[PDB]
Every structure is written in structure tokens, then in C-alpha cells.
Amino acid sequence: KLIEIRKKTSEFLHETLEESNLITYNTIENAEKKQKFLNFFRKLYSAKEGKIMTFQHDEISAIAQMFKNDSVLDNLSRPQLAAMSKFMSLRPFGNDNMLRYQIRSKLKDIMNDDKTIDYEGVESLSQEELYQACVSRGMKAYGVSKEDLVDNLKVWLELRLRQKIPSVLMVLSSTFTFGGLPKENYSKAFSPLAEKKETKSKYDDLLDLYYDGILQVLSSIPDPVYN
Ligand SMILES: [K+]
């Protein structure tokens, strides 16, 4: 069962993260980005019980975009790539270079598919196509209502097509719905605009939860400013 595979590979991946170096802080493009990076992590680690830190979607997205696929995939080990492949319902085989190729190949398929779906509208998809679309992108889908599948897929498309959040980081962040209750980071994502709506949509709520999974990955690794 996929659910089975996702629970074990997620839990394993979360273990690996605690000692992974996924980004090189000193190789960040420019000086303004480095200070954003410093501010973000300083803020992250200042959170504590009775001292919850809130992060804007746009605040998180700028940091998230520094964890680029090329660099992240090259930094993942073979066991991490294997677990990541299985989580994405692929059959991993070969050396780490081949695993990277299979994952990249898949992300290209997903890219071509995302364009199609976004142009036609998620509402044009059948129940069965929604289910499959979500599985392929690292999203639950199992036991999930059609409407919720639609909203999940809309969230994925906004973050990928419009916010440009790196897809590998995205997949890794979604493993945090399959643990393994996440280690509390006392941090939370929000959109100022959405917080002023008389009613936030399920989409808006799902968008916050997604950014929260991203924060969860960012709180999982060793302090990037030290390592
Ligand atoms: K925002």
C-alpha cells in the first residue's frame, strides 16, 4: 500500500534531515539574500512555547527559493533519494546519479502536466485524475473528498506556477503530513491579506498548512548558519 510506504519513508527522511546540510549559506547569491536568510533563521530559533513566531507566506517563499532543486538533490544521499523516490511512488534503481535523474525526469513530467491542468482548470479534471495528480505530487489523496483534492491541487499549482517554491523542497515538506507527529517549532505561516477576509477559504487554510510543512523542513535541519 502507498500509505504504508509513505509513513516509513517519511519517518526515515525526517531522521536523516536532522544531520543533513542541504544548502551552503556562504554560496547564497547576494548580500541582501544572506541577511534575509539570517533574519529568517534567527527568528525561527527564537520561537518557544509561549513565544510563537508567525511568518508571512512571502517571507517564507523568499527563503524557500534559496533551496534550489539542483543543489538540494546533489546534497541528498542515496538512501534519502531512495526514500524520496518511493514516497513519490516511483521505483528507484541504480546509483545516486541515476536516482537523481529519475526524480528530475518525474519533476519535468509534473511540470508539463501542471501547465496543462492550470490552463484547463483543476475543475476540468475527473475524480480519478485528481486522485492521481495528487499522488504524483506527494500529496495524500487517499480517503480525501473530491473538493479537497481540488483545493490541494490548487495549492500545489499556486506555489509551483506562481510562487516558484522549489519542487524538491515541496515534496520533502509534504512528507510531514505522513509522520510521525512533527517536532513542535512553535512557528506558523500566514497571509496578511487572507487574515482580513470575513471568511478564509479551504484553499487559504490549505495554503497556510503547506507553508507550515515548509517551515517544518526548515526547522528540521541543523542551523544552516553554523554548518
Ligand atoms: K504574504
From Swiss-Prot:
Entry's localization field: Mitochondrion inner membrane
Effect of disrupting the coding gene: Leads to the absence of respiratory complexes III and IV in mitochondrial inner membrane when MBA1 is also missing.
Domain Letm1 RBD intervals: 1-223
Entry remark concerning the domains of this protein: The matrix-exposed C-terminus contains a 14-3-3-like domain which is necessary and sufficient for interaction with mitochondrial ribosomes.
Cited function: Involved in mitochondrial potassium homeostasis through the mitochondrial K(+)/H(+) exchange regulation. With MBA1, plays a role in ribosomal translation and protein insertion into the inner membrane.
Assembly notes: Interacts with MBA1. Binds to mitoribosomes in order to recruit them to the mitochondrial inner membrane.
More about this protein: Present with 7390 molecules/cell in log phase SD medium.
Protein name: Mitochondrial distribution and morphology protein 38
